[PDB]
């Protein structure tokens, strides 16, 4: 069908790696919308299973990929809070529906709610640091950037340069931008007042994993007692916690470290590239949601109203 | 005689009031002291000459025990007098100490003019510095960067003895953009300091300090949030003193500067204290801007060795 072709082409593309986090998560809740819609169930403990089954999938497909796994979570607990409120209902198929759209509309609509308490956290004369190129950080300084007036330094991440082009969009916005080579981290911690970064995923302790510099980032923003914002919305957060069994690093080629012309070193140097690097919570100063900025210290009660704790493991 | 009349009325000027303002004053009436008790009592060699200095020292310090300038350069004159008797080990030793005590001289009434020096090298334009109290040092430190950069020093106002209101209005004259707030505030506006550059009473002997009160909770502000603090005190002001529990540390002023007299009967209720000195331990000290440079809290006992005797540390 059209609709498996596309589920197979979701998932490899996930293990590919061929888009930003915001339309991970609105073409999974499109997929997940058609994985209910079009497939035949009686009551919701099958769609359960088979929303459970895909999900697995999409999962090992790429484990370090935690929004589509976020998703899936939240389309799981919208089905059994659409389900526990008429507790085969035939109107459920259409519920849920909703409440995905509800969801959807939820989507499109959190890096607004992000931006608009740009004013509330950065002043006029501030000096703010960033690390990656995060979509949601970017349009926090440039709601900022409307009234105020910064300066930023994007420290670029080493592997793959991408707070080069975080450090253009900014430019090309009138902040007064800096490119760092992300070993001088601790050298300009001394100047900077505020640290703006996005994650990959907010784990559920407060910590996160995020891009490769950024453990080393909130060391020195905890040396110098620098505040570190962090601008991430509601399906960056995942229920897993930091445990030694599941594997949350994601290595990538030693062609971005260590070019393959190097030669006959390369058969004795072992070179590894990891892009993510876990940052614990007591590093963090705010999560800056779609619905406020509240600690570190709360995300474990957005668990509980996000995802049943029968769906953290899936 | 006209200098036994003098010494006790420094004592008695030390005891009560003032007399001399500042610190480098403060030394260099010392000095002039001590050199007339050199050259006016009859002394044979060195070993009487060094009793009659200690005892003298010795009710100066018990003068008023906080005034640590006075004590430090009756120990600098008796090293000075086991230096240049050193080198003759007599007739014209009674010369050669004047001439060293000279030399110290000399070494004061430049010491504010070396650390002014060394403002350029720590103070940067569109930087913040944060001071607590009026110091003469300080103040000479933040005017020779003036001339060259452009900052904005934020002056905490030590009370109840509002005396960073006559630095702030000092600073302002020379076109700082300065700011003094009330030093309840001293957290508060910490986060967006970049430098806090104080002046001290003393600096002890492991390098922790003895400065106006505010300053360890200023301390402890800027190592909470990581600004180095930078401590700006020539070495008049360095004691060979390690904090002892045994001696008094602290000055206890008049009540009346805190809760004035005019309270009426919950005065008889009340113990109201007023301490003027603040204990900030060596941890929360970054920098010793001296007149020889600008070395660590880590080396001060080091500077002990070179200026006091042992012998002489306990008068």
Request: aromatic residues 6%; proline residues 4%.
């Amino acid at each position: 069908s059209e609709l498996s072709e596309r589920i197979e082409s979701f998932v490899e593309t996930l293990k590919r790696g061929g888009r930003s986090s915001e339309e991970m998560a609105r073409e999974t809740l499109g997929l997940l919308r058609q994985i209910i819609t079009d497939h035949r169930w009686s009551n919701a403990g099958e769609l359960m299973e088979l929303i459970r089954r895909e999900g697995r999938r999409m999962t090992a497909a790429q484990p370090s990929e935690t929004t589509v796994g976020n998703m899936v979570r939240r389309v799981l607990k919208i089905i059994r809070e659409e389900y526990g409120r008429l507790h085969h209902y035939a109107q459920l198929q259409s519920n849920i529906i909703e409440a995905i759209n509800e969801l959807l509309v939820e989507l499109e609509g959190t890096m607004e709610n992000i931006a608009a308490q740009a004013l509330e956290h950065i002043h006029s004369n501030e000096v703010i640091m960033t690390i990656g190129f995060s979509r949601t950080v970017e349009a926090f300084l440039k709601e900022a950037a409307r009234k105020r007036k910064f300066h930023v330094i994007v420290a670029e991440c080493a592997p793959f340069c991408q707070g080069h082009e975080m450090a253009v969009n900014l430019s090309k916005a009138g902040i007064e931008t800096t490119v760092m080579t992300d070993a001088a981290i601790f050298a300009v911690m001394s100047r900077v007042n505020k640290v703006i970064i996005g994650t990959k995923t907010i784990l559920a302790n407060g910590a996160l994993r995020a891009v490769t510099g950024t453990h080393t980032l909130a060391l020195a923003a905890k040396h110098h007692s620098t505040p570190l914002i962090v601008c991430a919305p509601m399906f960056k957060l995942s229920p897993q916690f930091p445990n030694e069994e599941d594997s949350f690093h994601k290595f990538v080629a030693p062609e971005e470290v260590l070019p393959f012309t190097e030669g006959d070193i390369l058969e004795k140097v072992s070179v590894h590239c990891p892009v993510f690097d876990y940052v614990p919570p007591e590093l963090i100063t705010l999560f800056i949601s779609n619905i406020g900025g509240n600690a570190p210290s709360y995300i474990y009660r957005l668990m509980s109203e996000l995802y049943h704790p029968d769906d953290h493991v899936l």
